[PDB]
Symmetry: C3
Subunit: 231 residues, 3 copies
C-alpha cells in the first residue's frame, strides 16, 4: 500500500468519509419527520459509497494501468464508480429541496450519467488525442447541469419557503464552484496532459470530494429546510 | 478509423443522433408544462445516449474481439450499453402516454432489462451453439413486452384522451415493427449465423436505431398528447 | 458442463427458478387490482433474473478464476449480478407491504447495494487477508438492513391491516433467517476460508436462493395482503 506516494491522501480520504458517514448516521437517529428522513438517507449514503471506493483505491483494487503516450499510466477507475452513484444523489438533494418537477430531475440525472460515463470512457481510452474528445463531451454535460441549477432551480427556490431558498442558494453556490474544479484537475492531471503529478492530483480530488460530500452534507443537515413546516 | 468498412455507417449514425439530440434540446426550450417536460426529458436523453455510444464505436472503444467458430469475431458491445438505457426510456415514453400503473411499468422495464442483458451475454458467449440459447431467452422477453404493449396498453389508451389514444397507437405500431427487426438482424448477422456481413449489419442497425429513436421522437414531440389538457 | 461436480446443483437451481417464474407468471394473469399487480411484477421478476444467472453459471459464462492463496480459485461472479437486482426487489416487496416512507426505502436499497457491491469486490480481491475486510463491511451493511426490518418496519406493520401485519411478520422472519446464512456460507466456502468445498457450497446457496425467492414468493402471493381493501 505504502509503495504508492499518493497512499497518504487515499488513507486520509477513507478516514474522513468513514467519519462523515458515522456522524450523519448518528445524527439522523433522532429523526421521524418523513421529509427529513429523505434528506438524511440521501446524504448519509453519499459518503458511505465514497468510503468504500476510497478504500478500494487504498488497497489497490480500484486502480488499473492504461497504455497511452507510450507509457503504462496508473488510472484510478474507482472514482467513476463512486461518482456514478454519488453525483446523482447530490443532485437529488438539491432537486428535492426546491420540489423540482419530475422531468427536470430526469434531465439532471440523465445528463449527470452522461457526464460520468463519458469521463470514464475518456479515462480508459488508449488513443491519447481521443481522451480529450470525451473530456469535452463530459464537460458539455456538466455545463448543462450547471445551467439548470441556475436558470431552472434558483427561480424555483424563490417561490418556496425562505429557509429552503436560502439553504438552496448556499448549496447551489458550493456545488457550482466545487464541481467545476473536477474537469480542470482531470485535464492537467495524470488522466489528461500530465502536468500535475498523480500524488498532487490525488490530494486535490480528496479535498474536493470531502468538501463536496461531507462539507455539503454538514450545511444541508443543519438546516431547518429539510423539515416539513410543522407546528 | 477508416480501416473498418463499416465506419461510414457508424459516422452517419453518430451525426444523425447528434443532430437529433440538438433538435430536441432546442425544441424543448420553450416548454413550461410539467407533463410535456417529462416527455422532452425522456425523449432528448435517448439520442444523446445513443450519440455517445455510436461515437465510442466509431473511435473503436466500443468494439471487442470474441473467439467463436475458430475465429476472432468483431463484436460491438457498446450497442448493449446504449440499449440498456435507451430501450427502457422508450418504453417509459409509451407507458406515461397511457398513464400505465406502476406494476405494469416495472414489468416492462424488468423484462426489457432481461432482454438486453441476455442479448449481451449471447453476444459475448464463446460456445457457438449457446449463443442461440441466449438469443431465444432474449426473444421471449421481447415477446412479453410486445404482448403487454398490445393487450395491456392499447385498451388502456382507448379510455384516455383521443389525442393520446391516436398518438399511442401510431407509436405502438412503429415500436412493434422496428423492434421486431433487431433479433432478426442479430441472428443473421455477425453475432449469429454470419450470413450478412458486418458492414451491412451495421447499416441495418443504424437505420433501425435512427428510426426507433429520432423517428419515434419526431412523432411524439409534435403531438399535443404530451401536454396536459389546459385552457 | 458436467466437468464440474457442482453442475448438478446449478442445473437444479436453474430448473426450480424457471418453474417458479412460470408459476408466478401464470398465477398473475388473472389480476387487475393495481396494488396486487405491483407485488406480482416485483415477485415474478426475482426468479426470472435468478433463472438467467443460474443458467449462465451452468453454461460456464458466469465463472471466473481468481488468484489467491497461490491457487486459481473458481469464483462464480454471476451470483452478485443476480443479487444486485433481486435483493433490492425482495426488500421492495417488504417495504411496499408496510407502506414504508421513501427515505426508508432509499436507505434500504442503498445499504443493500453497498452490501452486494462490497461482497463482489471481496470475491474478486487477490490479496487474501483483504477479502475478509470487504466481507466485514458487507456484513455491517447487512446488519443495518436487518435492524431496519425489525426496528423501523415491524412497528409500522402493526398500525396497518391485520392481514398485512401478519404476512409482513412471517416474511420478515423468513428473510432475516435466510439472509443471515449467506455471509456464513461465503466465509467458510471457496470465497473465504475454503473449509467447505465448492460443490457443497453451491448446494447450500441453491437451497437458500430457492427458499428466499420462490419460497418467499409463494407465501406473499397467496396472501390477501397484496390486494387493496375492496368490497
Ligand atoms: C431512515 O432514513 C434515515 C436513514 O438514513 C441513513 C441510512 C444509511 C444510508 C445507511 C447506509 C450505511 C450502511 C450501514 C453502510 C455500512 C458500511 C458503512 C460504509 C460504514 C463505514 C464507516 C465505518 C466503517 C468507519
Ligand atoms: C439514464 C442515465 C443512466 C444514462 C447513462 C449515460 C451513459 C449511457 C453514458 C455512457 C455509459 C457507458 C460509457 C458505460 C461504459 C462502461 C464501460 C466503460 C465498462 C468498462 O468496459 C470498457 C472496456 C474496457 O475499457 O471493456 C472491454 C470490453 C468488454 C467485453 C465490455 C463488455 C461489457 C460492457 C461494459 C457491458 C455494458 C454494460 C453497461 C455499460 C453498464 C453501465 C456501467 C456504468 C459505467 C454506466
Ligand atoms: C427540463 O426538461 C426538459 C429538458 O430535457 C432535455 C435535457 C437533455 C436530456 C439534456 C441531456 C443532453 C446533455 C446536454 C448531453 C451533453 C452532450 C450531448 C451528447 C450533446 C451531443 C450533441 C452534439 C455534440 C452534436
Ligand atoms: C430490473 C432489471 C434491471 C433486471 C436486470 C436483468 C438482468 C439480470 C439480466 C442479466 C444482466 C447480466 C447478464 C449482466 C452481465 C454483465 C456482464 C456481461 C458484464 C461483462 O462481464 C462478462 C465477463 C466477460 O464476458 O466478465 C469477465 C468476468 C469478470 C470478472 C466479471 C465480474 C464483474 C461482473 C460483471 C459484475 C456484475 C455487475 C452487474 C452485472 C452489473 C449489470 C451490468 C448491466 C449489463 C446489467
Ligand atoms: C402487469 O403486472 C404483472 C406482470 O408481472 C409479471 C411480469 C414478469 C416479470 C415478466 C418477466 C418475465 C419475462 C417474460 C422473462 C422472459 C424469459 C424468462 C426468464 C422465462 C424463463 C422461464 C422458462 C424459460 C422456463
Ligand atoms: C445506490 C446504490 C446503488 C449504491 C451502490 C453501492 C456501490 C457503490 C457499492 C460498490 C459498487 C462497486 C464496488 C462496483 C464495482 C464493480 C466492479 C467489481 C466491476 C468489475 O471490475 C473490477 C476489476 C476487476 O476485478 O475491473 C478491472 C478494471 C476495469 C478497467 C474496470 C473499469 C470499469 C469499471 C467497473 C466501471 C465502474 C462502473 C460501475 C462500478 C458500475 C456498477 C456495477 C455494479 C456492480 C454496482
Ligand atoms: C463527490 C464527487 C463529486 C461531486 C464529483 C464530481 C465530478 C465531476 C463534476 C466530474 C466532471 C468531469 C468532467 C466534467 C469532464 C472530465 C472528467 C470528469 C469526470 C472529471
Ligand atoms: C434504440 C435501440 C433500440 C430500440 C433497440 C432495440 C433492440 C432490441 C429490441 C433487441 C432485441 C434482441 C433480441 C430480442 C434477441 C437478440 C438480441 C437482441 C438484443 C438484438
Ligand atoms: C436471492 C438471493 C438472496 C436473497 C441473497 C442474499 C445475499 C446476501 C444477504 C449476501 C450477503 C453477503 C454478506 C453479508 C457478506 C459476504 C458476502 C455476501 C455478499 C454473501
Ligand atoms: C482548480 C485547481 C487546479 C490548480 C492546481 C494547482 C496545483 C499546484 C501544485 C503545483 C504543481 C506541481 C508541479 C510540480 C510537480
Ligand atoms: C429485417 C431485415 C433482415 C433482412 C436483411 C436483408 C439484407 C439483404 C442484403 C444482402 C445480403 C448480403 C449477402 C451478400 C454479402
Ligand atoms: C449456515 C450453514 C453453514 C453450515 C454448513 C454445514 C455444511 C456441512 C457439510 C459438511 C462439510 C464438508 C466438509 C468435508 C468435505
Ligand atoms: C447510472 C446510475 C443512475 C442511478 C443513480 C441513483 C440515483 C437515482 C436517483 C433517482 C432520482 C429519481 C428520478 C425520478
Ligand atoms: C438496468 C438499467 C435499468 C434502468 C434504466 C433507466 C430507466 C428506468 C425508468 C424507470 C421507470 C420508473 C419505474 C417506476
Ligand atoms: C444497483 C441497482 C439498484 C437498483 C435495483 C433495482 C431495484 C430498485 C427499486 C427502487 C425502489 C424505489 C425507490 C424509491
Ligand atoms: C453556462 C451555465 C452558467 C453557469 C455555469 C458556469 C460555468 C463554469 C465553467 C466551469 C469550468 C469547466 C471547465
Ligand atoms: C405475441 C404478442 C403479439 C404481438 C407481438 C408480435 C410478435 C412479432 C414477432 C417478432 C419476431 C421476432 C423474431
Ligand atoms: C442487529 C439487528 C438485530 C437483528 C439482526 C440479527 C443479526 C443476525 C446476525 C446474522 C449473522 C451474520 C454473520
Ligand atoms: C493530443 C491533443 C490533441 C488535441 C485534442 C483536443 C480536442 C478537444 C476537443 C474540444 C472540442
Ligand atoms: C450542450 C450544452 C448545452 C448548454 C446550454 C444549454 C442549452 C439550453 C438548454 C435549455 C434547457
Ligand atoms: C450451432 C447451432 C445449434 C442450434 C442451437 C439452436 C438453439 C435455439 C434454441 C431455441 C429453443
Ligand atoms: C488471513 C486472514 C487475516 C485476518 C483478517 C480478518 C479481518 C476481519 C476484519 C473484521 C473487523
Ligand atoms: C473510523 C476510522 C476509519 C478509518 C479507516 C480507514 C483509515 C485507513 C487507515 C490506514
Ligand atoms: C453536429 C454534427 C455532429 C457530427 C459529429 C460526428 C460525425 C463524425 C464525423 C467524422
Ligand atoms: C421448464 C424447465 C426448465 C429447465 C431448463 C434448465 C434445466 C437444465 C437442464 C440441463
Ligand atoms: C465548502 C466548504 C464547506 C464547509 C463545511 C462547514 C460546515 C459547518 C456547518
Ligand atoms: C418510422 C419512421 C418515422 C418517420 C419520422 C417522420 C417524422 C415526421 C413527423
Ligand atoms: C422458507 C420456506 C418457505 C416455504 C414455502 C412454502 C410455501 C407454501 C405456501
Ligand atoms: C462520530 C460519532 C458522532 C457522535 C455524536 C455526535 C452528536 C450527534
Ligand atoms: C452566499 C453563499 C456563498 C457560498 C460560497 C461558498 C464558496 C465555496
Ligand atoms: C461560479 C464560479 C465558478 C468558479 C470555478 C472555479 C474552478 C476552479
Ligand atoms: C439543430 C438546431 C435546430 C434549430 C431550431 C429548429 C426549430 C426549433
Ligand atoms: C396507423 C399507424 C401506422 C403506423 C405504421 C408505421 C410502420 C413503420
Ligand atoms: C406487427 C408486424 C411486425 C413486423 C415484423 C417485421 C420484422 C422485420
Ligand atoms: C407451471 C404452470 C402452472 C400451471 C397453473 C397453476 C395454477 C395457476
Ligand atoms: C411466525 C413466523 C415464523 C416463520 C419462521 C420461518 C423460519 C424459516
Ligand atoms: C433471527 C435468527 C437468525 C438465525 C441465523 C441463522 C444463520 C444460519
Amino acid at each position: 500500500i505504502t509503495g504508492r506516494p499518493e497512499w497518504i491522501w487515499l488513507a486520509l480520504g477513507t478516514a474522513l468519509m468513514g467519519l462523515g458517514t458515522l456522524y450523519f448516521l448518528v445524527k439522523g437517529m433522532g429523526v421521524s419527520d418523513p421529509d427529513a428522513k429523505k434528506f438524511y438517507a440521501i446524504t448519509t449514503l453519499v459518503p458511505a459509497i465514497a468510503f468504500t471506493m476510497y478504500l478500494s483505491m487504498l488497497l489497490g483494487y480500484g486502480l488499473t494501468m492504461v497504455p497511452f503516450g507510450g507509457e503504462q499510466n496508473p488510472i484510478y477507475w474507482a472514482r467513476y464508480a463512486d461518482w456514478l452513484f454519488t453525483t446523482p444523489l447530490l443532485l437529488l438533494d438539491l432537486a428535492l429541496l426546491v420540489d423540482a418537477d419530475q422531468g427536470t430531475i430526469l434531465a439532471l440525472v440523465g445528463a449527470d450519467g452522461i457526464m460520468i460515463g463519458t469521463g470514464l470512457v475518456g479515462a480508459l481510452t488508449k488513443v491519447y488525442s481521443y481522451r480529450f474528445v470525451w473530456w469535452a463531451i463530459s464537460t458539455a454535460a456538466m455545463l448543462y447541469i450547471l445551467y439548470v441549477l441556475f436558470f431552472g432551480f434558483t427561480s424555483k427556490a424563490e417561490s418556496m419557503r425562505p429557509e429552503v431558498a436560502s439553504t438552496f442558494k448556499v448549496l447551489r453556490n458550493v456545488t457550482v464552484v466545487l464541481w467545476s474544479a473536477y474537469p480542470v484537475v482531470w485535464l492537467i492531471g495524470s488522466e489528461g496532459a500530465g502536468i500535475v503529478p498523480l500524488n498532487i492530483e490525488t490530494l486535490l480530488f480528496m479535498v474536493l470530494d470531502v468538501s463536496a460530500k461531507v462539507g455539503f452534507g454538514l450545511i444541508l443537515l443543519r438546516s431547518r429546510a429539510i423539515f416539513g413546516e410543522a407546528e
